[PDB]
Amino acid sequence: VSYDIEHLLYYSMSPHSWTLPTDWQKMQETAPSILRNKDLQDESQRFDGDKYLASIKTAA
């Protein structure tokens, strides 16, 4: 069960890769200082795997 960077970056574009972590409630209390992207309607600061994969391909 292995994945190259191409596969891993493709899966970042899944809707399931943007939902909050399952432990979000516990995380709000554990480490609130490290949390970001709290509004799911605002995808502006969401990681873009497509752009990241393209960036790698230019360095090659």
Partner 1 sequence: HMKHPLMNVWTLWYLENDRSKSWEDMQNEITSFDTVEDFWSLYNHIKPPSEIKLGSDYSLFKKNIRPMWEDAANKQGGRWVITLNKSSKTDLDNLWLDVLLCLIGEAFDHSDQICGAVINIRGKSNKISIWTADGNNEEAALEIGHKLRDALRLGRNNSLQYQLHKDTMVKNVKSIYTL
Give the shortest CB-49-to-partner 1 separation in angstroms: 8
Q: Which is nearer to partner 1, 38 or 41 (CB)?
A: 38
Is 54 an interacting residue with respect to partner 1 (CB under 8 A)? no
Which residues are CB-neighbours of 53 under 8 A, at least 6 positions away?
5, 6, 9, 10
Q: Which H helix or E strand runs over 27?
A: helix 24-30
Q: Which residues bind partner 1 (CB under 8 A)?
A: 1-5, 7-9, 11-12, 14, 16-24, 26-27, 30-31, 33-38, 46-47, 49, 52, 59
